[PDB]
Every structure is written in structure tokens, then in C-alpha cells.
Design a binder for this molecule. Structure first.
Ligand SMILES: [Cl-]
Ligand SMILES: [Cl-]
Ligand SMILES: [Cl-]
Ligand SMILES: [Cl-]
Ligand SMILES: [Zn+2]
Ligand SMILES: [Zn+2]
Ligand SMILES: [Zn+2]
Ligand SMILES: [Zn+2]
Lengths: 207, 207, 207, 207
């Protein structure tokens, strides 16, 4: 079990690692994780993941009450929706990472499972990835969709937006996010070449 | 309000962040920001954004008079044109960032709005992006075009060249630039795949 | 000859260099090298190549007995298969590097030589690259295939997975891996453009 | 005028900057620059540009006599050919940078001018880029071709290999190389889209 010290510390470090390696650019992205007391540690509003301050990270209750730190990111609203309908979720990584965001802008995505597996690792660690329709940023329908999907899915693709990825810790959610982004990137790299997709039996083996 | 200390400091740091992360390569790019006294702080001529010296950053008046530091970048000429016709502009980021430059070399661009929105963030923070025709570097027509566009547009695409992005601070202009470059990159990533563009009503919601 | 100090040190440094430069993401990848006593130094299970600890790197015998450090990566199983059938192999780099992994998901790969050479360097330093069929992670058939290929090939492409690259040291295996990944990347960059492949005589000159 | 101290220093720093930013991978690439005494400072054989040691950089005469430091890179042979037929050349950057190497593997390149300009900067700072046919590494025909081209061209594309870029200093040659690589990258980014190429009059303006 990690303390609030190390959790605040981990959040700053993970933010910097994501920013320096291109997963987050500019003002985009936010991180959250459950604290020991059941409250939420989150990156503050208008923040840059490469410039986080452990001391000023937001703390909010799952019901939306602001507890300490700078005012939370406005997207923490739909972070909470996930926590409130999945007790296994201890941390959420939300990014506009390039290829997962690209995938989110495509027409004709399978809304229940937008990544057709050709590598085993997303299946083992994440599972299927549903798609939330596009809505104006701040729309309550975003959080509503996530609350309904959270009991069955460990990650979510917000159409015309980007991924929302859960995990049993912040580092595990970050690893899940990096695995997802790498898989989305492989989609665009493979392009229209003939892909050796995983067979139906090969996908069932990985659960 | 930031002091000249911190402003010179911010410019060096932002330059290094842009250079290390690939937004600027070699000798390309320049930064400017309005000082408290109404003069312009700018990156010097023949400079490399990853090797800026706070102490030697150029200071020039909006009318072109060189005040302190190394001689300004020659492209500060069209930086000033923007400031002189947009009092909301406090900082300008000019880069040859790859995908915005690529977009600038295409034929058939909409000269009033070259980015057809499929994500909300460029619409919210920047708006439409006009295109300036290509002219020999140093041509006064570049600054002339920018002066005429500056009252209505917060960013500009110089054809066969690259973006010129304004902001209410250097960090905000850098975030706008990073958002624009990411959006241009998404264009080339999405390619000829069918894109779920934002509807006309979805674009009007974001102003 | 390097000591265990420097070998543990080299492994941590090489891991960090691969992680910071994008060759490894998240929890993916592992390194191994032969120690002076014939045992294997390897990166531990559930490890992140950018966060290795020299002091806790695993040590295992080539027959699978765990000797010191954290429990080895589960993929060290097929590392050992290579060592046990190639005495020239002193170090193995396994990554899910993007373009070699992409190449590994394609249909119709030549299973004996999946990289058709258009640059001399993979031929000089690595040679032909066979393809191992896809199998569920942990399948003994993976190690079996590698043991049979190891006497004739210095690198291997695990289908729907990624590269396994040998070398006379960890740095040489890393350089071989970087050369291979760059060559795989060139394949996807060149795309369907007409390539000046190396002639048959030009390939024979490089051995 | 820079001293040997600063020149050795600049070479190490420039190497690290090129390696960390992806222009050089593994064992590929070499740098050279003319010393005040007319001898050549060069990166040593089997070296990694991110791990250079100022103290052990090679010094060789333009006629090939090894003077100090580790044994020079074998590719310094064709570095010297350029110096011996262009007194304006004070530094040479040779890389296998991805997109310039990709361009070098294409069929049907214009051997006198392989980059059709759609941005002004390669024309202003480099000029036309000839193509040297592919030859086995170490072939004297490589140096022969470069010696014949050096009086008229400031950079050269070795087919199936990579760029060789001159400059009036190491930093200027590095900036030329970065500008060239960015232009080659734009070629592959633009792909088969209709490009607004620079007109014939627009290219003549830039000399
Ligand atoms: Cl926010
Ligand atoms: Cl300039
Ligand atoms: Cl493992
Ligand atoms: Cl060499
Ligand atoms: Zn978002
Ligand atoms: Zn410019
Ligand atoms: Zn693996
Ligand atoms: Zn070379």
C-alpha cells in the first residue's frame, strides 16, 4: 500500500514521463487515483502533465466535493463516474494520445469493441474497448455513458476525443494506456496491408 | 503579472521544451512576447530554440527599433504585424512544426479555414486558421497579410512555410501551437479514411 | 571482459536508453546477458526498462533455476532457449519495438527471411531473420522454435509479438536491435513506392 | 574562431543531441570537422554518437594519416574526399537519418537534384542534392564520387545508405542536416497529395 506522499509523487513522475515521451501535449490530459481514505487525487485544472506540483494536486470526493489542492480538472467529472461503478478501478489515465485519438475520430467504429486484436496484450490486460459517442466537452452524457460502461470495461474510447483507461494503480493504468496507444498506433502503421489477426480461439485463450 | 526576469526565463524554458520534443529543429522557429512596457521580447537571429540565453534575448519596439540583446530574428518583422493589429495578442509562437508545415505545402487549402474540425479543441481555443500565400522569406507581403488577418484570427498558416500562433501568454500560445500541430498531425494520420467530422451545430457550440 | 558490476550497470543504462527513446513502452520488453560464471543476468518480471535496479536484476541458470534478484521475466524462458543452442550469443534484447512488431503482424511473411534487404547493414551484422508462428504467450512452442533456429540465425521475429535479437554483448545486441527496427521502419516508410533493393550479388558481398 | 577544446566539446554535444533526438541510432553516423592546423577531428570507429569522449576523438590528416585518439570511423575516408575538393567545407555530418535514408533507397531519383523543393530553406542553405550510386560499404567509388561532386554541392545522398552534409562549422552542418531530414520527412508525409511546389522563379530567388 502506497501513502499519499508516494501517490502524489507517483502522479507527478508519471505525468512527466507521459509528457516528455509525447503521450501528452500542451494542456491535454489528466490523471486520477483513489486515495486510502476513498477520496480522489487528481491533476488540477489548466495543468500541464510535465509541470505538476505534488503539493497542489487536487483532492475531491467521488461525489464531486473539492477537498484540497487546486481546483480539479473539469474532466475529473467523468473520472468519478468510472470509480462510482467499478470498485476495481483505483486509477484513471485520460490522454489525447495521438493514435487512440485518431482511432476515436473514425467513422464506423465497433461501439462495443473498437480494437480488433492482432496482438495478445490488449486482450490480456484491458479487454474490449467500447466507444462513447462524441458530445460537447462538459456534457453530462459523457459521464453518463462512462458510468454505464464502467462495470464491464476497463478502458473507453471517447469519440472525437481520446482514451480513458483504468487500472489497479496509476502505473498499471499508465501501462494499460501505453499498451492501448501502441496498439492503436499499430493499426495506422499496418494500414491496408493484410494483417494476421488473432483467431477467435486465440482471443478466448487470453482471458 | 510576470516580470521580465520570469518572461525571459519562460522563453528559454519554452524554447528548450519545444526543441527537445521535436517541434523545432535546427535553426528554425522564433518566439516573441509583449513586455510590461509594451516592447517585444524575442528570440535572437540565427538562434536555436534549445540553446537560448535569457540575458541576450532581443528586445525591440513594435515599430521595429532594436532596444536590447542580440539582433532579433528576421521573422520578428511579421510577429510585430500581428501585435500591431490585435491587442489581445501577448505572445507569438512561430515554428516549422512538421505536420502544420506539411499542411502548409498542400494545394487547394481553404484560405479562410484550412483545418476542417474533427476535434473540438482547436475550435475552442484558436478558431479558424487562415492561409497566407507563399512569398520569398523576408517579403513585406508576409507581414502585410498577417496585419490584415490579425484582428480576426488567432493563428495563421504561412503557405510553404509553417504556423504563426498567438496567445494571451507564451505558455498559452505554446499550448495553442501544440494543439494545432497535433490536429494537423491527425489529418495526415487519418489520411483517406472516413472521418467523423464535427457537424455544423457541433462547431457552433464551441464559441 | 566486463564484471558483474558493469554488466548490471550496462543493463540498467541500456534499458533506460531504450525506454526514453521509444523502443520500449510500458511493461514490454526484457534484456538478458551471460555472466562470467555462465549464468544469465536478466530483467525481472513486471519490470519497466526505464526503472531497472541494478541490485535486483534477476540471475538464473540456463536450465531455469532462479539464483538471485527478483523473479525473472517470464519471457526469459525463450531467452534461455537461444543461449542453449548458440554459444556465440552473449546477450539478448527482446522488445515490442513498433515497426518490427508491425512487421510481425503481417500476413505472407517469408518465414526464413522476413526482411528483403535494401540497406547493407542488417545483412552485415545480423543476417536473415526467420519468423516464429504466433503462439499464446508462455507457450513452450515459442522456446522450441527459437532453440531450433538459434544455431543459424542471430535474430528472430515472433509473429504477432516482436523481435528477439542476439549479440556478442548487450550493447551489440542493442545496436543490432536498433538497426533491425530502423530497417523495419524503413519498410513501412517506403510503403508501395518502387524500392531499389540490393541485388543478389550485392547481398552476397556482405557476408 | 573555436579552439580544439571547444571543437572536441561541440562534437560530443552535437553527437548527444543528434542521438537523443533520433537522428542517429545505434552505431550509425559519424561527424568530422577541420581543426585550426588543417587536420581532421572525427568520431572514432565503432562509436555511438550519444557516448562520445572528447579526449579520444580521432585526429587524422586529410591524406589519411592517423594522428591522435581512437582509430577514426571507416567512413571518414569519404569525409576526407569532400574536404579535399571543397575549401569551404569545414565540417561534415553523416547520418542514417530515417527519411533521408528512405529517400536514398527509392528508384528513379534525379541523380543531380533529388529533392524537388516545396519549402525555401533547403534551397537557401544547401542547394541541390546529388545522388551517389549504391556501392558496398568501404568501396573506393564512394569517396571517388564525393570528390567529384564536392566542388559543386554542399550535401550528398548516398543511395541505399544516407546523407552526407557539409557546413561552415559543425553546428551549421548539423542545422543543414536537420533541415534536409525535415524536408525528406515532408516528402513522405505529403505522400501522393497534390503539393504546391515552388515555381521555377521562386527557386531562382533563393540563391
Ligand atoms: Cl480543465
Ligand atoms: Cl533569422
Ligand atoms: Cl513478465
Ligand atoms: Cl566504423
Ligand atoms: Zn480530454
Ligand atoms: Zn519561419
Ligand atoms: Zn514480448
Ligand atoms: Zn554510413
Amino acid at each position: 500500500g502506497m501513502t499519499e506522499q508516494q501517490l502524489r509523487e507517483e502522479m507527478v513522475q508519471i505525468g512527466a514521463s507521459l509528457f516528455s515521451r509525447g503521450y501528452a501535449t500542451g494542456s491535454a490530459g489528466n490523471l486520477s487515483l483513489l486515495l486510502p481514505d476513498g477520496n480522489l487525487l487528481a491533476t488540477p485544472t489548466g495543468a500541464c502533465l510535465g509541470e505538476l506540483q505534488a503539493q497542489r494536486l487536487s483532492v475531491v470526493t467521488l461525489q464531486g466535493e473539492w477537498i484540497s489542492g487546486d481546483k480539479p480538472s473539469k474532466e475529473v467529472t467523468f473520472h468519478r463516474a468510472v470509480y462510482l461503478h467499478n470498485p476495481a478501478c483505483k486509477a484513471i489515465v485520460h490522454l489525447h494520445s495521438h493514435y487512440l485519438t485518431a482511432l476515436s475520430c473514425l467513422q464506423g467504429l465497433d461501439p462495443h469493441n473498437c480494437i480488433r486484436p492482432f496482438t495478445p496484450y490488449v486482450v490480456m490486460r484491458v479487454g474490449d474497448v467500447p466507444v462513447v459517442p462524441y458530445y460537447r466537452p462538459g456534457d453530462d452524457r459523457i459521464a453518463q455513458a462512462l458510468a454505464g460502461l464502467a462495470p464491464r470495461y476497463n478502458a473507453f474510447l471517447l469519440a472525437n476525443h481520446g482514451p480513458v483507461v483504468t487500472g489497479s494503480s496509476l502505473r498499471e493504468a499508465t501501462n494499460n494506456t501505453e499498451e492501448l496507444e501502441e496498439t492503436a498506433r499499430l493499426i495506422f502503421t499496418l494500414g491496408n496491408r493484410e494483417i494476421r489477426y488473432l483467431t477467435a480461439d486465440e482471443v478466448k485463450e487470453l482471458r
